[PDB]
Design an enzyme around this catalytic site. Structure first.
Site, PDB file in Angstrom:
ATOM      1  N   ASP A  57     -88.848  16.848 -47.496  1.00 49.03           N
ATOM      2  CA  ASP A  57     -88.898  15.422 -47.172  1.00 49.03           C
ATOM      3  C   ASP A  57     -87.841  14.932 -46.180  1.00 49.03           C
ATOM      4  OD1 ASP A  57     -89.085  12.617 -47.279  1.00 49.03           O
ATOM      5  OD2 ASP A  57     -89.726  12.666 -49.366  1.00 49.03           O
ATOM      6  N   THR A  58     -88.209  14.796 -44.904  1.00 48.54           N
ATOM      7  CA  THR A  58     -87.256  14.331 -43.889  1.00 48.54           C
ATOM      8  C   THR A  58     -86.827  12.878 -44.112  1.00 48.54           C
ATOM      9  OG1 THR A  58     -89.114  13.806 -42.386  1.00 48.54           O
ATOM     10  CG2 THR A  58     -87.994  15.938 -42.099  1.00 48.54           C
ATOM     11  N   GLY A  59     -87.612  12.132 -44.881  1.00 47.91           N
ATOM     12  CA  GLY A  59     -87.263  10.748 -45.145  1.00 47.91           C
ATOM     13  C   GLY A  59     -86.320  10.597 -46.325  1.00 47.91           C
TER      14      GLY A  59
END
Lengths: 99, 99
Positions: free
Chosen positions: B25-27
């Site tokens: 998850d880059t967020g």
């Protein structure tokens, strides 16, 4: 472009003729943006998260230009502290993860 | 591995002797795991997402293996809806975004 992750992967997006900075969120199925004035009709929707859920206005076929690329898709407008670009749009600008 | 986003970016991770699937998850700035038995002590902490904040246990210097790669760092265990591998770990496996 290629982007590392030591910082938040924030890009500039043009939507509804307005400019915004958003996050390239590989963990988000949907694209959710803080309150922004979008024209037209929409449907009330519920979307869950880490803290639970928020109700958002769902706008379909919204055109966005992320970092210089164009994409059309669903944009959820509701109370979120950050603008998130989800996979529905990430798949359109040909975004991939590499490691 | 080059990962496309037409599907959720799931990966097999080994942590604390157990196997789990986690969403790259880059967020996410942090790594947050759902109910899992983790040895040691910790420092309480509350994190936010969409829908509000959640209380979690904060363990430091935890060995983690995502695919063939090892990483050590802080892991958060809480009521999450999905195991999340955030930037604090992603940077360590050289994970990058490309478009």
């Amino acid at each position: 472009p290629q982007i590392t992750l030591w910082q938040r992967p924030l890009v500039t997006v043009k939507i509804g003729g307005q400019l915004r900075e958003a996050l390239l969120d590989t963990g988000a199925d949907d694209t959710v943006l803080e309150e922004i004035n979008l024209p037209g009709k929409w449907k009330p929707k519920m979307i869950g998260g880490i803290g639970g859920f928020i109700k958002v206005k769902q706008y379909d076929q919204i055109l966005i230009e992320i970092c210089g690329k164009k994409a059309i898709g669903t944009v959820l407008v509701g109370p979120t502290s950050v603008n998130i670009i989800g996979r529905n749009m990430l798949t359109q600008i040909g975004c991939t993860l590499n490691f």
